[PDB]
Design a protein around this ligand. Structure first.
Ligand SMILES: COCCO[C@H]1CN(CCOC)C(=O)[C@@H]2CCC[C@H]1N2S(=O)(=O)c1cc(Cl)cc(Cl)c1
Length: 128
């Protein structure tokens, strides 16, 4: 399925090249511009665990998730991955635990040492 495909066929987008964050662009976005550090970014996403279960979805809440990029407001994989996206892009990200919740996890939902899979749509970005 899609998690296997990004695992086996995705691009390593880490500066370290440590295969910690892998990406496939699923729906090509607009032009060339990506958000810059500190921009307010609006996304829709879903997340799955490696047991095959969906653990979260913004779609199901009927509103996007909004954060300030590159500030550590989200897991490292998200700051890295969203920074690569164009407006309107949909991607798949595979996030090893070192770029997510690590050995601690985040109970109740995120186990220790969890590799996370996301589908992410970048709706918009704006400077404040
Ligand atoms: C109901 O909350 C939905 C948005 O949750 C964020 C949680 N965070 C920030 C806090 O942890 C550092 C995240 O970084 C990531 C990525 C952004 C979207 C959400 N997570 S998540 O999908 O990995 C997530 C979802 C849920 Cl339901 C619980 C936990 Cl612990 C993480």
């Amino acid at each position: 399925g899609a998690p296997a495909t990004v695992t086996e066929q995705g691009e390593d987008i880490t500066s370290k090249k440590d295969r910690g964050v892998l990406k496939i662009v699923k729906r090509v976005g607009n032009g060339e511009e990506t958000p810059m550090i500190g921009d307010k970014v609006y996304v829709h996403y879903k997340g799955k665990l490696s047991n095959g279960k969906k653990f979260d979805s913004s779609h199901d809440r009927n509103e996007p998730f909004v954060f300030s990029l590159g500030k550590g407001q989200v897991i490292k994989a998200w700051d890295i991955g969203v920074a690569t996206m164009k407006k309107g892009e949909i991607c798949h990200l595979l996030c090893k635990p070192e770029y997510a919740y690590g050995s601690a996890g985040s109970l109740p939902k995120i186990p220790s040492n969890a590799t996370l899979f996301f589908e992410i749509e970048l709706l918009d970005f704006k400077g404040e």
